Subunit: 33 residues, 3 copies
């Protein structure tokens, strides 16, 4: 498990980082969005 | 721990998938949103 | 690993909770957003 868990957590971290950026752009209205 | 960790990661994956869909709908403006 | 995994999952849970709130505010248009 622990190896599989490591991979899924790393996937999630990448996805959470991208969502934070997208949501921060939506909240601030960057680039006319 | 490892059993608890598995459950929380699975919860997070579901939540991250729903957030991606919602944010992709906000970014693309689907359905007048 | 398992200790490191616990910390990253906890970080992710906090971040996912904040994103849910922000996205729910964007979807519902709370506070004129």
């Amino acid at each position: 498990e622990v190896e599989a868990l490591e991979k899924k957590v790393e996937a999630l971290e990448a996805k959470v980082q991208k969502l934070e950026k997208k949501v921060e752009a939506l909240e601030h209205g960057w680039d006319g969005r």
